Structures are given as C-alpha cells and as structure tokens.
Symmetry: D2
Subunit: 300 residues, 4 copies
C-alpha cells in the first residue's frame, strides 16, 4: 500500500524543489537523499567539497535503505518515501524494485525531462552545487537511455555522407548570425568550404543543413533559395541535398536539426561526420552517435 517514489532526472531538473513542495502538500511522506547524507557524514559546508570512494558510497547506500525500512515500518500515518536522487543508474533503480518486492511496497517513478540547453543554463548558475559539464553530459546520456530516445549506429547499404551547417560553419559569423544583404565572397569561411569540396571529390555526399527559417507565409521558400544560391554558386559547395527549418517552426535549433536528421538525412545516407559551430547543436550530434568537429567558439 505504501509508496517508494524515485525521482528520475539530471542535476538541475527540479527534483529537490518538487520533493519539498510534495511533502508540504501531502503529509505522511518523507525524503531520503544521497547528497544530504554524503555532505552529513563528512560534515562539509559546500556540496562540491565531496570526493567519491567505494567505502563512503557504501555507507551512504546503507543509510538510504536502513532509513527507508525504518520509516515505512511505522503506523498508517506514514504514506510513503521519496528518494530525491538522480536515479540514472539502472542498477540502483533495480535495487529499489528488489527492496519493495521483498516487503510489499509500490514503486512509483517521477520523471523530470528538462531540455539540454536549459540544464546547462541552470548548471552554470548553480554555484557550489554545480557539476562538471562532462558529468552533466554523462547523465543526460543516461536520461536518454531511460526515456528510450534513439542513438544512431549507421545506415548500411546507403551512400556515405558528411553533414555541413551554414550558421557560423560555412559562413563566417559577424557579431546572432550575418545579414542576407551581406551574402558575398567575404562571408565565406575558407578552410571549412575547402573541406566540403575535398570530401565531395572523395565519394562523400555533402548534405547541407540550416537553422534559418525557410521563408514567409506568402512565400514559404524565400530564404531557402537565397541560402542555396549562396552555398551552390557563391561558395562552391558540391551539395546533393539541402534541408532547413520548415516555415513557421518556432522550436529550438537543438530539436529542429535532430528532426531533420531522422526524417530526411538518416534513412537516405550513411552519415559518418557532422561539421557544425553552435555548441548546443554540436552536443546534439555527439550524443546521438554522429561525430562532430566544432569549427569555432559557438556559445549562443
């Protein structure tokens, strides 16, 4: 009858803020947190001062389960417990399902799916509770595994290709990209454009992608043609295909380019590489299996 709620989410996804507000509005619920015990057994003031050990982490796991057994063995006043950890490791989630089955408690899951760009923005302002960017990346990968989101592993039988972006990659940025009035030979990124020709003259199919809205309501392909006439004629990129943001799509550069990949690029080509600039997009190709070469500082 009693519940064991596990919060699933990367650091900064809102787990602690919810757990506090849930216990206030629903009496009988208690919190069990790893970070709280880690900081308590060492008497630390700042959460970043902590250094992991198999011995320390073993004591913390012990404190979690012993406290869970003790609280849930109380009267009918005790409705359940919340484990406000990241719970991104499959072995830890299984350990809580093995534990509930042995004593007759219900395991519930509270998922906190927050976008990557927002998680990084929150982690930079987190202060002493901030995690290194490589561990936040490692955790968003575990979040995608839990959510069941796709990872690319190739497309056998189709031609080999390289994806090129226009936004700050083939086109040198000024200042927030460059104007469509300034589209001449002085806005070309020499080394990157030389790379597209070098790959095209080696059996690779050059697929060009862009985040720029394709057109207006009255003319849906206005900017698409003004971008293709630059990439093909003024830049000299030997492209086989150019798909960009559909007219009227207000979504983030992050999700638009992933959708363009799975719908138009992935089923027709065997993508071996992606040349991009913007950090959030570079992070996206890398986590879904496509290899990236970030050509410039693209922070956003």
């Amino acid at each position: 009858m009693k519940k064991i709620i596990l919060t699933i989410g990367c650091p900064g996804s809102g787990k602690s803020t919810w757990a506090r507000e849930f216990i206030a509005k629903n009496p009988g619920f208690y919190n069990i947190n790893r970070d709280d015990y880690r900081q308590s057994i060492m008497a630390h003031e700042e959460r970043d001062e902590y250094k992991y050990t198999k011995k320390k982490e073993g004591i913390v796991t012990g404190m979690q389960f012993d406290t869970a057994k003790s609280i849930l063995y109380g009267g009918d006043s005790v409705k359940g417990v919340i484990i406000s950890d990241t719970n991104l490791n499959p072995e830890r989630r299984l350990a809580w399902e093995t534990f509930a089955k042995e004593y007759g408690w219900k395991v519930e899951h509270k998922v906190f799916d927050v976008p990557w760009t927002e998680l990084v923005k929150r982690n930079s302002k987190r202060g002493t509770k901030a995690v290194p960017i490589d561990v936040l990346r490692s955790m968003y990968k575990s979040m995608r595994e839990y959510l069941g989101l796709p990872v690319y592993n190739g497309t056998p039988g189709k031609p080999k290709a390289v994806i090129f972006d226009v936004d700050g990659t083939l086109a040198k940025m000024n200042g927030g990209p460059y104007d469509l009035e300034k589209c001449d030979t002085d806005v070309i990124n020499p080394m990157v454009v030389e790379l597209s020709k070098m790959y095209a003259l080696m059996g690779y199919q050059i697929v060009v992608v862009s985040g720029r809205e394709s057109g207006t309501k009255e003319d849906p392909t206005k900017y698409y043609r003004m971008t293709r006439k630059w990439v093909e004629d003024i830049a000299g990129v030997p492209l086989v295909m150019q798909c960009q943001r559909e007219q009227g799509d207000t979504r983030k550069d992050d999700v638009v380019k992933e959708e363009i990949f799975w719908k138009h690029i992935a089923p027709h080509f065997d993508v071996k590489l992606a040349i991009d600039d913007r950090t959030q997009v570079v992070e996206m190709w890398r986590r879904i299996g496509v290899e990236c070469w970030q050509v410039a500082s693209g922070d956003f």
Copy 2:
C-alpha cells in the same frame, strides 16, 4: 581502537566547525548529526522551517544509531564516529554509553565551554540557524549542570538579604557618566532599598566600577560609598565592588563577589540589577532578579 566522540556544547559553541576540521585532518572518522537528518527528512531549505514532533524525532534517533552501527562495523579503515549534536540532555548521553557498552566502543567527550555573552552575540548573527533566546538559556543551564557549576538554594541561619547594584540600578543612566549629584538618583529603586531595610532585610550593595587606581587602590570605592550612604540614603550593611587590576567581564566579577563575600554571610532572596548579562547571571545561578531598565550593553 574505535571511538564514539560526543560533542557537548550550546548552539554556536563551535561544534560543527571542529567536526569538519577533525575529519579533514584525521581520516577514518565520520559525522552523524541530528539537525542534518531533521532538515533532510522534510526536504527543508533552511533549519528554521523544521517543526518538532515526537514521531519525527523518533525517526531521527533511529537514523543516528543505525548509521553508527553500520559505519563502526567496517574493518580497520574506520577510526570512529563523531556525534555533532548538543548532547545536553543526560538521557541521550546515557543512550550512547549503553550503545557503546553493548558493542564495545569507547565514548569520548569533546566539551565546548563558551561564555554566555559570546553565545548570545553569536546567536544574534546566526541567521536562519538561530535559536530562540529562551532555548539558548535552557541549554546553558544544561551546560552548567554537565560542567558541575554551582546553583544557589539559600543560606539558612544567616540573615535574609537583597542585593542592589549601583550603575543603572540605584543610579540613573546618563547617555554611566562622571563621578555625581542628587539628580542622578533613581527614585523608585532607592525607595525600594529603604523599604526592604526597614523590613529586616540586609541591603548588600554591589558595583561594577573599579575600586581605585595604582597610587590609591580604594579611591573610587569611597566616592561610590559616600554617594550610596549619604546622598542616596540607602541603609547598606556591606558594599563590595571590583578590585584593582580586575579587567574581566561584569558577568564573572559579580558571580565571584557573590560566592566569596555575600553567599556565606547572607541568605540572598533577591537581586535588583540593570545590565542584561548580569541579570542573566543571577537568574541561572538560583538568585531571583528584577531588571529595572533596558540594560543591553
């Protein structure tokens, strides 16, 4: 080889600051704290939000002992545990010695004796970790019980008396100014001394001013007594005050004057004072106080 260190001290005595610095320089030691678990089971952002109930306090006691058993059952890597609580309740200190007797662990005690005036000064700046002044008082009383410090309960056979202070009490506050006239008299308090004396009480006058200087060790004492006896009209039987090179706090000087000169000769039923720290002192050692004005401090 395995210790269970209990920190004894009021909130603000330096327990957490020590525990953190001890675990850093002595590996193998782990911390078990009550406030940390209280804040954790409720998911609170600060200490102040925690509402005390016997059901929550029972779970917290459980977490303390279960974690202590688990950590201490772990080979030669663990040197012991620190219980960074106030440990001012005798029943809780006994429970840790019973736990140690039952599993063969050594209970060590780390005492943090910090003076009252300093504890109040630290508690006012403590913010959200601040405790109500009545609970800080209740805890310093438990600290004195542990330290074995004396509490007055009377002195039978000896004559009944009332202690009166000078500065702020029998003498009005100017702004403690220069040494005085007939206009510096506190009417209602001086009227009280004449009334108690007439009732068969011994008026004992005490003072926080220095008795004299290096050349004359009893200069300011005589100028204070000539005011209390002649200009004020207080029927005193004795006047003991701060000696020569005594540069200590008003707090400890008046407690020493009490135990050495007043307590063995008189049966003190009351103390009329002004300064908060001194008023707090008489009250915790058993003497009753009537604070006549705002004396902050």
Copy 3:
C-alpha cells in the same frame, strides 16, 4: 514633478523589498541607499563588519546628495529617486526637504509601520544584516515620534499607583504556558512579588492588577478570587482581556492602560514578566521591573 521618495521605517520593515519591486514596475526611478555605500567604500563582504566614523559617514552623505543631483539633473526619462534608508532622524529628513526647495523637487514619504513583535522576530533571523536589539529599540522610539504616537509623562492630581501583571508575575508558570483554571492554589504564588504588592499598598500606592487571560465573566472572577483571597493582594481595580479579544498581549494591555488606568491613576511603576509587554510599558513612558525571563 520630479520626486524624491524617502522610505520611513525600522530595519526589517520591508523598505528594500518595496524599493526593488517599485523600480521594476515603474521605469525611470533610481535607488540611493546608505548601507550600500557604507559597504562599498570599505569593500566589506557583509554589513556587520562596518565601523562608524565621522569621516566615513560624511563621505556617505556626500555620495547620497551628489548622486541625487546627478540623476535628477537629466532627461525627461528620469521620473524620480528613492532614498531607501531608515530616515528616522529628523535632521536627515529636513536635509532632503531643504535640498528639494533649492532645485524645485517634490518630497514624498513612504511609511512602513510594522509592529514591534514582528520587527524583533524578523531581526533575529536577519543574520549578518541584523542590528543590536538596543538600536532596534532606539529606532522604534523614533518611529513612534514620527507617527505621533503618545508617550506618558504622568497624570498630576490623581492617586499614585503601581501596575501588576498576574500570569508570570503575581503567579508562577509551568515553563512556557500559564497555569490551568482549577489548578490555582497557594504554591503557585510568587512570594517576593506578592510581598511587594502588600508593601506598596501600605506605602500609599493603589495596586492596579491587569491580566492577559480571556474573561461571560467566568474566568475573570476565577482570577480575582485568587488575587484578592488566595494571594492577598490589596487591589483597587482589576481590568483584563475581553471575551473574544483575539489580539496581542502587546496592544491589549496598552489599550487597557490608556482607557481605564491612565485617566484615573498616576502610574509610577509597572511590574511585569513577558518581554513584549515589558518593552511596551518602557517605550510609552511607564517604568518596568521585569521579574523573570519572559521570552514568549
């Protein structure tokens, strides 16, 4: 008209929280604060480290007025400035009105009247921005002067009296919660305080007893039968809290003073226990003797 808004209120009354929310909702307004400049010229990490000097406070006053002149002597975009200080000193409030009359600006006043009990509760949790209780007292006195609230100085011609509280004073307590109704005996008497009421009654004083208990008059006559018969206090009058008076001990006893006690007696002293009530008698002019630790 270009404004100069002065915030009037003790530390913890909500001045900074308002000033921030006003500038956000009303563009063109700028803030000038003393504590911010005091902390800035010394490069301090927290405002309890600061040491007040005549040279330093003079520089801070200079920064206030020079910044006010500079901001207000600009475009039609600048609507006015907020001086988020306590402004409890009459000389500083006058200096800002003199400043507005030599350049033609309007001085508006934003009053923050927060009760004493609430100010102390906020100051204990204020942390490093906390002020000593004696300066918070000194400031609430200046707030009462500004608000025009009364201060007692005697009532010549009427009989001299001493006010006595029941719970905590004439009667002992259990710790933190008064004694039960039918549990009032002879062992609940506070010896030294009850002896004092008999002393004063013989000394020509009128003993006025006051209580904070509700209360029909069932609980009132239960209290008076204790004070008069079991305790032996020679009272001339006993006024207490009404049937359903859900207010504070603080304000109820001040009202009982001005309506029933002050016009009939010349109160020379008040014997009380509870800190908030002791603080109340003292600030309105009546002298107090706090008989025990009354924090709550």
Copy 4:
C-alpha cells in the same frame, strides 16, 4: 601625493578579495566599484539580474568619478582610492589617467594574471556572480592585449601547414592510453583520413603531443613509440613531430603554446589546428590559430 589604484583582471581573478584585505591592512584607502553601483541604483539582490543600458552605465561612470574626486579632495588622512573593476577596456583606463593628470594624482596598476583553466573553474562555481563563458573569453582576450601576449597572423613565405594532436585526436581514448595497447583498432578513422587528405592538398602535417618523451634513465623512450605509431600504424604523412620534454611537469595548455612559438611558427604558415582537449582548443583559438575540436574533450 595621493594614489588611484586600478585593478586589472578578469572576473574571478581575485580583485575584490585583495581590495578588502588591502583596506583592512592600510587605513586611509577607499573602494569604488562598478558592480556595487549597478546593483545599488536598481536595488537588485543579485548581479545576474542587471540589464545593460547606456543611460544607466552613464550614471554609474558619473558615480565613480564624482566619488573619487570627493574622497581624494579630503585631508592628509586620505591616502588613495581603489577602483576594483575589471578595467580591461583601454578607454576606461585612459579616462582614469586623464583624471589623475587633471588633479595631480599617481595612477598605480594592480595586475591579476590568473590562467584560463583556473578562471573557468572559478566561474562555474561563482553562482549568481557568474558571467557567460563568451564574455569571460572576450575578457581574457583583453587581458592578453594588456599583458602584451602574442597573437598569430600567419607566417608568409614559409610552407602552409595543419597541426594535429595524438591523444584524443588521431588516437581513440579510454576516458589517456597504455603504450602496450597501441593497435590499428585505436585509430580515429575520420581524423587520420583528414591528415592524408590535407597532405594530398599540399599542407605540411605537423604532429604535436602532450605525452612524456621519456624516463630518467632514457630521455627519449616514449617519443620513438609515439612516432612509430603515427608514421607506421596510422599512416599519417608527417614532416615533423615535437612533443613534451622529460621533466616538464607544466600544463598541456602552456607546453603546446611554447612548442608552437619555438618550433612550429617560425618554420611553417599554420592555417589550422585539429585538437581534442578543451583547454588546448581554447588556446589555439585565442592566439589566432583556427581549431576544429574533434570530440568532447573536457579534462
């Protein structure tokens, strides 16, 4: 005469911590700070809440100079003032020298040169006083300009080249690698294919590494092992390979910049650098060399 001390340094370099400790140890000194006034005129509780307006930044500049004139025009008790700003803009530093020349005051400079890697580490833990990574970059660029540190603009006449890195770039990683597990299965396909494609276009392939060259007894043991992998097992057509020395216990950051200025820059016209580790990628980019970061190299 009286001083006007200007602190020069990026946010997180220790300017405020010094200014506080200097005023405590040296009486007569006063602080004038921009961030303090910006936060004060808007009555904000946090620094990240402030929005940059030109009417506002103008009022803040006004408050700075008016307070400086007022404090320094005092008695012989006033010894000087500290301007605890970043002071990375040359126009603002000049404005304080024009001001000091106009009233007869000595301008002193207190430089806070803290390495890039350390500045980023401090900025990630700074909380609400944290600055966006692009503005921290823009500020470290202004710090290099002040310090007079070099920026590459090409090397004409000399042959065109592309710089490659071994660990992480040409070779796949474990999280470094063991010298015994150097197969053909440890090659990064697309990057090694690029070194062959760039050599095919006429670029000189210069390989660099942050790995040790050898032990105490044999100073050139590991250099032979790394080159026998790059040349034979990987198939990279290199013209030169310079790497970290024997007892060089310094950062990957500074070692590769020194290898660039001493051995690579005077002999080749570097058009590009292919690297992996973030700190090294940040280094090539700020000194003028273009980088293509091949993988997540945080670490």
